[model samples]
Target chain A: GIAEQCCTSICSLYQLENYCN
Target chain B: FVNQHLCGSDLVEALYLVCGERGFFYTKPT
Candidate 1:
């Protein structure tokens, strides 16, 4: 599932995968 | 010099899939 904020610090860094899940 | 899903074309693909051309520059450390 996707979140409201698709671009954040964590996701932006690409450090964590599937953060929406 | 590579990570999970952010290298070469992988970065472009991942951004396109996840953020709809939004995560391209979103996932940049340079």
Candidate 2:
């Protein structure tokens, strides 16, 4: 989930490990 | 249900799965 947005400030700064719900 | 998808954005990073820094930037922020 979160890991799907890096270059995007709209997402978490880091590629979250627990992305999917 | 949206954000970026901007004139030059993708509403998403599109590169999160790549920055496997596996470490950290500040750990080496220059």
Candidate 3:
């Protein structure tokens, strides 16, 4: 579960870059 | 010190603290 949040936050912090789809 | 490895942020530390020292994703090939 924690990993899930981390994944979201990682990309969320990278919002401007659109690193994920 | 940490800021540089993380490119300037606390997010990475928290990730290690929460998951483990080597926890992360492979955003690209290496």
Candidate 4:
């Protein structure tokens, strides 16, 4: 599902905050 | 989740297109 993918993407970004900092 | 709210997160968070393009959970819809 698209929603699931979106959520998964968001979760991935959150998990990759290291790059953000 | 009916048409009235067919948009946004109707199940978990009713979030609209919550994605992270460059690391941002932005909604797909306005």
Quantify all predictions' global Cα lDDT against the true fold: 0.39, 0.29, 0.36, 0.33
The better candidate by lDDT, 2 or 3, is 3
Give per-residue lDDT, candidate 4, residue B7: 18
> If both were scored by TM-score, which would come out higher, candidate 1 or candidate 2?
1
lDDT of 1 by residue, B1-30 (tens): 133324445544565565563443433443
* Candidate 3 stretches greater than 4 Å from native: A1-21, B1-9, B26-30
Chain B in candidate 1 has what TM-score?
Answer: 0.41
Off by over 4 Å in 1: A1-21, B1-5, B21-23, B26-29
DockQ of predictions, in order shown: 0.08, 0.09, 0.09, 0.06
List the candidates' TM-scores in order.
0.34, 0.16, 0.28, 0.19
Tens digits of per-residue lDDT for model 3, B1-30: 121223223445444344454454423223
Interface RMSD of each: 9.8, 10.1, 10.4, 10.2
Between candidates 2 and 4, the TM-score winner: 4
Minimum summed lDDT over a 10-residue window in model 4 chain B is located at B11-20
Off by over 4 Å in 4: A10-21, B1-30
Docking verdict class for candidate 1: incorrect
